[PDB]
Amino acid sequence: SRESKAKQSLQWEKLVKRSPALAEVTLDAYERTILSSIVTPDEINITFQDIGGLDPLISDLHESVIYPLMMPEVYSNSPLLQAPSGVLLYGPPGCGKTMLAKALAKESGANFISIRMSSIMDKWYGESNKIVDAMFSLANKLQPCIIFIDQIDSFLRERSSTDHEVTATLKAEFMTLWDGLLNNGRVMIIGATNRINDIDDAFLRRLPKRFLVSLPGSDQRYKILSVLLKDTKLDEDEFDLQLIADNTKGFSGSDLKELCREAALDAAKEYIKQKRQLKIRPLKTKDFTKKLRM
Amino acid sequence: RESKAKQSLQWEKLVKRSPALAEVTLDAYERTILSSIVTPDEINITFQDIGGLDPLISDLHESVIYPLMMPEVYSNSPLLQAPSGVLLYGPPGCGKTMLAKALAKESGANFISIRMSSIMDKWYGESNKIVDAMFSLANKLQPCIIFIDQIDSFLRERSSTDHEVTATLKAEFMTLWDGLLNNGRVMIIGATNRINDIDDAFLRRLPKRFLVSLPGSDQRYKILSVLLKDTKLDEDEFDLQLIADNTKGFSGSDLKELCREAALDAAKEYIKQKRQLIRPLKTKDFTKKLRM
Amino acid sequence: SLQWEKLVKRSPALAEVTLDAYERTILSSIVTPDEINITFQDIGGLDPLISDLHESVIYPLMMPEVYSNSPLLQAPSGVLLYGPPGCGKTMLAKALAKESGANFISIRMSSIMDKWYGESNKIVDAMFSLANKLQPCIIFIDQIDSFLRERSSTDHEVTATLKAEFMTLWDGLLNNGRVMIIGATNRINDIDDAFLRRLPKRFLVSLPGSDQRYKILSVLLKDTKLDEDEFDLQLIADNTKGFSGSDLKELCREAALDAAKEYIKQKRQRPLKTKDFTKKLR
Amino acid sequence: SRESKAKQSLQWEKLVKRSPALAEVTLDAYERTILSSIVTPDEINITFQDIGGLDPLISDLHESVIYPLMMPEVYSNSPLLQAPSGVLLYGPPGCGKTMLAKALAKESGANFISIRMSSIMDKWYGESNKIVDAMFSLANKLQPCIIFIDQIDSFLRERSSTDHEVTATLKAEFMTLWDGLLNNGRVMIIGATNRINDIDDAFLRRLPKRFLVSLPGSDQRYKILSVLLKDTKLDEDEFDLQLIADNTKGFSGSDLKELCREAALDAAKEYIKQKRQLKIRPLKTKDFTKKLRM
Amino acid sequence: SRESKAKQSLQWEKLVKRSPALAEVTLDAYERTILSSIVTPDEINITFQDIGGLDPLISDLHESVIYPLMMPEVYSNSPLLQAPSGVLLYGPPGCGKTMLAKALAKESGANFISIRMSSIMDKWYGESNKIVDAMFSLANKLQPCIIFIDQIDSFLRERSSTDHEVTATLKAEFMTLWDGLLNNGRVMIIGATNRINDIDDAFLRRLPKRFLVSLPGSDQRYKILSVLLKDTKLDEDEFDLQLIADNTKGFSGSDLKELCREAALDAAKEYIKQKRQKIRPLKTKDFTKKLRM
Amino acid sequence: RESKAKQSLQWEKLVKRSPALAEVTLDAYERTILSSIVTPDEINITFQDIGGLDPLISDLHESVIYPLMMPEVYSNSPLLQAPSGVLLYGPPGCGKTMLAKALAKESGANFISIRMSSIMDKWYGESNKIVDAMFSLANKLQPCIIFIDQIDSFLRERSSTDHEVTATLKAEFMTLWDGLLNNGRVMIIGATNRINDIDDAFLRRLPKRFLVSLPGSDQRYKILSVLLKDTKLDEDEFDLQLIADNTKGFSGSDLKELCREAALDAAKEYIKQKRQKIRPLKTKDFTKKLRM
Numbered sequence A, D: 001s002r003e004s005k006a007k008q009s010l011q012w013e014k015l016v017k018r019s020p021a022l023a024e025v026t027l028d029a030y031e032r033t034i035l036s037s038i039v040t041p042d043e044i045n046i047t048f049q050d051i052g053g054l055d056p057l058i059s060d061l062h063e064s065v066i067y068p069l070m071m072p073e074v075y076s077n078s079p080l081l082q083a084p085s086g087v088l089l090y091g092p093p094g095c096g097k098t099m100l101a102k103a104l105a106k107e108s109g110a111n112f113i114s115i116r117m118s119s120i121m122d123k124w125y126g127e128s129n130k131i132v133d134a135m136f137s138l139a140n141k142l143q144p145c146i147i148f149i150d151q152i153d154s155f156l157r158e159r160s161s162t163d164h165e166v167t168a169t170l171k172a173e174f175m176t177l178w179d180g181l182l183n184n185g186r187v188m189i190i191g192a193t194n195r196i197n198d199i200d201d202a203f204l205r206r207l208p209k210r211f212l213v214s215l216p217g218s219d220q221r222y223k224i225l226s227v228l229l230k231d232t233k234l235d236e237d238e239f240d241l242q243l244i245a246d247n248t249k250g251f252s253g254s255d256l257k258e259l260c261r262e263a264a265l266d267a268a269k270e271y272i273k274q275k276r277q278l279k280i281r282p283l284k285t286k287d288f289t290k291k292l293r294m
Numbered sequence B: 001r002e003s004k005a006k007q008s009l010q011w012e013k014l015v016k017r018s019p020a021l022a023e024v025t026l027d028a029y030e031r032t033i034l035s036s037i038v039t040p041d042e043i044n045i046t047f048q049d050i051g052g053l054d055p056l057i058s059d060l061h062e063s064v065i066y067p068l069m070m071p072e073v074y075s076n077s078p079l080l081q082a083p084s085g086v087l088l089y090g091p092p093g094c095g096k097t098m099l100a101k102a103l104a105k106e107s108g109a110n111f112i113s114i115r116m117s118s119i120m121d122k123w124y125g126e127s128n129k130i131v132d133a134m135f136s137l138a139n140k141l142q143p144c145i146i147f148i149d150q151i152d153s154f155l156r157e158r159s160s161t162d163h164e165v166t167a168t169l170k171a172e173f174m175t176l177w178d179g180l181l182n183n184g185r186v187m188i189i190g191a192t193n194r195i196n197d198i199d200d201a202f203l204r205r206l207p208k209r210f211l212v213s214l215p216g217s218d219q220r221y222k223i224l225s226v227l228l229k230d231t232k233l234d235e236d237e238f239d240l241q242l243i244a245d246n247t248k249g250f251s252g253s254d255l256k257e258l259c260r261e262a263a264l265d266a267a268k269e270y271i272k273q274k275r276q277l278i279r280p281l282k283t284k285d286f287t288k289k290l291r292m
Numbered sequence C: 001s002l003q004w005e006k007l008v009k010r011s012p013a014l015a016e017v018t019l020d021a022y023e024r025t026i027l028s029s030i031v032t033p034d035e036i037n038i039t040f041q042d043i044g045g046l047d048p049l050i051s052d053l054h055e056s057v058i059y060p061l062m063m064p065e066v067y068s069n070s071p072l073l074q075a076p077s078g079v080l081l082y083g084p085p086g087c088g089k090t091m092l093a094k095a096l097a098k099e100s101g102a103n104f105i106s107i108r109m110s111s112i113m114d115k116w117y118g119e120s121n122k123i124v125d126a127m128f129s130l131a132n133k134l135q136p137c138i139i140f141i142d143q144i145d146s147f148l149r150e151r152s153s154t155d156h157e158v159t160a161t162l163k164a165e166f167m168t169l170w171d172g173l174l175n176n177g178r179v180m181i182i183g184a185t186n187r188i189n190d191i192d193d194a195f196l197r198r199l200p201k202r203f204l205v206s207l208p209g210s211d212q213r214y215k216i217l218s219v220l221l222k223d224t225k226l227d228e229d230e231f232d233l234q235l236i237a238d239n240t241k242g243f244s245g246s247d248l249k250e251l252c253r254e255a256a257l258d259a260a261k262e263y264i265k266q267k268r269q270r271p272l273k274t275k276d277f278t279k280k281l282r
Numbered sequence E: 001s002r003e004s005k006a007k008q009s010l011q012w013e014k015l016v017k018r019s020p021a022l023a024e025v026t027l028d029a030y031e032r033t034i035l036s037s038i039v040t041p042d043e044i045n046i047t048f049q050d051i052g053g054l055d056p057l058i059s060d061l062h063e064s065v066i067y068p069l070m071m072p073e074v075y076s077n078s079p080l081l082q083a084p085s086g087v088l089l090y091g092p093p094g095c096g097k098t099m100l101a102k103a104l105a106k107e108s109g110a111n112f113i114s115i116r117m118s119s120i121m122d123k124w125y126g127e128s129n130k131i132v133d134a135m136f137s138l139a140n141k142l143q144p145c146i147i148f149i150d151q152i153d154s155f156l157r158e159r160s161s162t163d164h165e166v167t168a169t170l171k172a173e174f175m176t177l178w179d180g181l182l183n184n185g186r187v188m189i190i191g192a193t194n195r196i197n198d199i200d201d202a203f204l205r206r207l208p209k210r211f212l213v214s215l216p217g218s219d220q221r222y223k224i225l226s227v228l229l230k231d232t233k234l235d236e237d238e239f240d241l242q243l244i245a246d247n248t249k250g251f252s253g254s255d256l257k258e259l260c261r262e263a264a265l266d267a268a269k270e271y272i273k274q275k276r277q278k279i280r281p282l283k284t285k286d287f288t289k290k291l292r293m
Numbered sequence F: 001r002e003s004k005a006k007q008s009l010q011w012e013k014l015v016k017r018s019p020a021l022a023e024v025t026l027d028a029y030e031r032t033i034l035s036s037i038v039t040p041d042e043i044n045i046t047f048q049d050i051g052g053l054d055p056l057i058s059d060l061h062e063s064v065i066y067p068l069m070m071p072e073v074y075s076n077s078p079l080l081q082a083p084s085g086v087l088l089y090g091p092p093g094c095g096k097t098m099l100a101k102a103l104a105k106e107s108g109a110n111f112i113s114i115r116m117s118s119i120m121d122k123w124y125g126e127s128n129k130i131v132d133a134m135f136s137l138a139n140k141l142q143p144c145i146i147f148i149d150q151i152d153s154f155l156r157e158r159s160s161t162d163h164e165v166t167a168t169l170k171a172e173f174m175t176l177w178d179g180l181l182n183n184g185r186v187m188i189i190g191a192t193n194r195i196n197d198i199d200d201a202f203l204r205r206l207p208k209r210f211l212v213s214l215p216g217s218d219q220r221y222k223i224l225s226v227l228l229k230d231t232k233l234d235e236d237e238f239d240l241q242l243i244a245d246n247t248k249g250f251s252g253s254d255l256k257e258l259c260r261e262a263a264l265d266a267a268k269e270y271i272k273q274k275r276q277k278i279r280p281l282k283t284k285d286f287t288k289k290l291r292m
Ligand SMILES: Nc1ncnc2c1ncn2[C@@H]1O[C@H](COP(=O)(O)OP(=O)(O)OP(=O)(O)O)[C@@H](O)[C@H]1O
Pocket: A050, A051, A052, A053, A054, A091, A092, A093, A094, A095, A096, A097, A098, A099, A100, A193, A194, A213, A224, A227, A228, A252, A253, A254, A255, A257, B178, B201, B204, B205
């Protein structure tokens, strides 16, 4: 995979130019394959000002996740003020957890590692355990680090005697590198999941800072609608967004995203017609109302 | 070795239709995904071949194809772009497969119709790599539509009793759908019969959903007419309107059958002549068959 | 190898075709006409159904250039044979493999469902790809209700994805080039609605009525020597109230034994007339 | 890799400087790869005074694990006073078992070997069996030794005819080196596991010193809370730790660790604010109480 | 390896000094690597007087395994009185099978070969088949021989097509050397296993002498407890071992070993203390307080 | 060294039994194959040592040995010659190895029994040369039988995941098989337990296959009798027929072991005396052992 070597070299050079301290460090081959899956902030478009309706959760995320990890000499006064061993983002679908991860890669200066199953599980015997060990060793090398397993429930499923051999030893490798004897040096394991119940009890044990990114309430739906509708031109009087926010009974954040898109199209209908035959309509209450059936 | 021939054929055709993709190379799994790419020239269904769904065709255009196919038209606002995924759900035989066929026909997106045989593999972790290669290929073929036909089985209600490779495969799929590394203009169009069997997260990231429902009187009329083209009808003895409304609750393919069987009924004499070596399709054949 | 060489010697145009391993495992379950003993003169009491089967199943499939005049004169995507037990459906399939020159594929669950992950979906894809290669083809899933059962969220995952693979190859985007899916079933109700929807040419092979039972009785009793006067088959036919075709087969066997009783005794050391049937069927 | 060679050389020189009697011994290549995964006491921060709520278990661990292994000439009186063939640490998650292993590497002078699946299972045919044989041969060379397979249930899973061949032969190699004909000379196999049931009966049979590191009771939760809160400044009167210990109904040790961290942050909130704009508040009952919902 | 070469040279010289008739025989390299894994009696501490609760099985083991192999001119009267082609020791865990092998290496004078998977399966192509062929050729050279594959179920697992190509040809090589055309000259293949069911039917078929080393009964638990407690000082009256024996409901031999070790430490608790800063007679208190009937 | 001595010994013995083999020389790999040639004098099993297989022995003769060993007898018709290969398949312990032994004994063909240790080599392309040398040697030793014991491992279901040297080795073997359509009067006799694991092409060029099945009552009788020769039995207190039809499903070697154990159990006194004739082998030992 020549694209994988290009990605490894690109991600490496970028990692050594933002943090010059990592130059003297070399890697094994599996560590380089893990380096192929490192997300830097410049390729992510979501910030905290792009996340709405979660401000207390953003502040808690800061005060107990980023600052205890990113600035240790600030917290060096007490030995029990340091970063968690792992963070779990769990909740109903479409409430922000993926953008929480995106803005964690954006604001927090930790070398962010977002890896998936395709880069962990391998065909050959014992390669995937070595991939996990290389992942954690790389995280120890990149001392401020966040290892992200998106959709982490599948990876941390209820262990059973009917599991596949490699899967079981892979889970044991992962847990050991998480809370084993050679403890990770300032390495955080941030995970996003939709079903917390499918996670094994030991895995959840060592994933101890867990945030309920729940369905948005009236305030949260208001802040989300407003956050989504930026860079679009609204209406002065014929538009009341408050009722619309509350009218969406139990709608998640992405359900709002889709309804906002569909209404943006329904308001720009004349723009579609004009550029089909060759001034967006102020986004007022008509489109949202005719769509969502209050 | 027909897989290699299909890969090479589909690739050369992809680079001759769109010349900008010559500099791009692929990994092996990406090539196995390339083996399952449908081009428009091998599909014989168009929008003029789909009847009784004209408002749905127009909605499909205005919110699926143009927001995907022509972005610089839609660059004025950041919330005018393509959906992350489209679902075609409804009762059986209402058009969804031909909706996909004509999406591969009219829409110029590099259409990927893949099935379970090309995703699931015997070996450990190969199927997750197949999914990652699928989406990476879709990102390479920047205007793309990835189509999982009969998508309910793939997106079934997730459970702790699932198979491990199935569960991690579902997680890989969802992560490539709405993860951090967001897809660049990649749409995931899916057809399903039972929307309820789809998991809530999978449905959540599949937000453009169309009810391709059972055809009504207008829709049955337009379908009957669309099907009966290229066949020779009758002037007076035929009244198609009553027949359209007589087929209460019949799906589109059920109509396709009462039309084939009646075509055979009428042209029995034509076959008889060839046995030795057509008839105007009027109300008699349809009426004697469908029992009002 | 045997089925392959026989397929290329009957139809020479398929020599240039290459196969995949799973396609060859599907090739292992192909039925040629020479190993089947049932013809349309071996099926009795179903003559209108045989004629309908011809005119809407075999000829629309076997002779397309005859029907090339209209685009809606083609073959059924699939053909269901449903009805009460023992009415002829298996012999309908046998004589479809006999008379119709389509490369007949009769497969069962043992050759589809496999232990390993994702092998069975590949087996289905290879089955249909082989059917596309053997362009006039009939794929036959005997006892097809179990395979096309009411889909549920409590199904096994490999079963569910296998059903989805099957349906997708039946009426998905890439069209099956002249490939027919003929299925026999006893309970049509257990078939899923989508499966039934794409299997629309459905024939009710029902319980034989007096006239049909007469024809069945006559068809079964060939190659056996009957009686001139003391035998009246008509009453016997109608007297079998609601008996299926195989029920008639068994009663005819038992009466053949009861008439050949002296033949048993002689080889240990009769004209089939009304006595044996009458004393048996009450 | 080259870092693996550096780790082998470092671990070797440290092993020969702590115990001078092993200078004359040389190793095969696989034995050196096993030497790459040896944990010395100086890289582990946990001692027995760092383990709370397990004092009878610590004393039993001493009297039947360390002293029968570490001091044999003391027990040479009777032939049935020697070290066990293996020790299992099993129990519910987060009750101390990895710190039990850490302090076994700390206090007990046995040349501790903590190995994982990434260093055992290899891609090539028959390498992993040779890795196991080299592991035990090295343990025999380093005569007072403890071999530690963290999360040992995955490695000792219920055997089946549907196992992978390399996995099955690897299990047979391991068992044979554990209780075969060439018996190990003073070599102990200490293992930690969460689910004892997944362990095969033969593997458990030859792992006969098993400790139930169970969920902490009221006394144990008291001792754990006290052990965790050292090096942090508490309150004199407004703090009553006893109720807090017995308020945590069924909480494991790490669940207490996380709640203590979160309360330390919630008490040092003014320190966060001060170093954001530039003492620690005595850790009293308010933080723990407002958090844990008694 | 230099340690491996020292092991080969040491095992070789010891083999030629115990049995002088093998001096004229030379070996190929693979045969020498097999010679590196030969167990002589002097490095094993277990005898038949160290095995308890299995006397009828010890006597059967003698009469149908050792003597038919070790003394052939005694059995030369009939052609059907010779050694088995293979012996299998199967049973529940911890019932004695490993010590059965140890005392087979101890009493029986056969040149005992205990080999494991690390010495058979190799990385390179076709080396492991040559290792098997060299193993059996060496066994034929060392004419009274016992080849031991400890934990033999993994090696003789149910053959399938899902198996590795080397593994399969290795199994075929092994079986062919076991009961092929060039029959082994007085070579016995003794194997120990815990799960007999995982063994392939052909592999089991050529392992016709199979012993059920089952869980110990009341008599067997009595004899085991007594065998284990030798060289330790017991009590006269306050100790009744019979009840202890029967009380251990379904305990294997090693479960008894561990119990006995724990109770020895619980009785020597005073000696432990004193020596750290002679032994209490091992009476019923320690066993009773531990095993919960 | 030992290989060289074995090669020289086997060669000189081959040229002294058949003097027509002198003018022929060999390549090095052919000599390594010559190192694995079994002559009749080192095998103790004959056709009077095989019991319970007399129809199979006669079929083996009439369609395997005589069509190979005596061609000028069968030169009348071109379709009366030796098979390209013979497969002995069946349940374990039914006689197949002794079938091979007595094929090396009675049949005068220069028997080659080879195993995988002599075929598969470490170096690249040596093992294909070993196969080619094997068959070339068989062509030189014109009446020949090449024996691969445990053939199913060698002839396993071919797959794309097989080792390259293994796959090319299988292709070399098959090519040398179809090459010799009795052109060099070379027969490939193989014994296997699992016929199903054999590849279809391998099995195809292996047409003469014998089911050496589990012994029936007659076969168990003949086996028991064959095994108990050279041992002294009893006149009245011994009824063997009972024992023969009593061993329900026992293979031949299962009988061998039970006969040994009963021989020991009857000679117990003789053994004792010698430790410081045999008891007539009567029904007591067998009955007390086999549990009906
Ligand atoms: N709190 C929020 N504020 C603003 N936009 C949001 C919020 N939550 C969701 N969205 C919109 O929904 C889309 C996807 O949401 P996201 O995937 O982050 O939620 P999620 O909880 O991770 O979803 P899932 O649980 O299904 O993985 C984003 O593109 C975003 O525009």
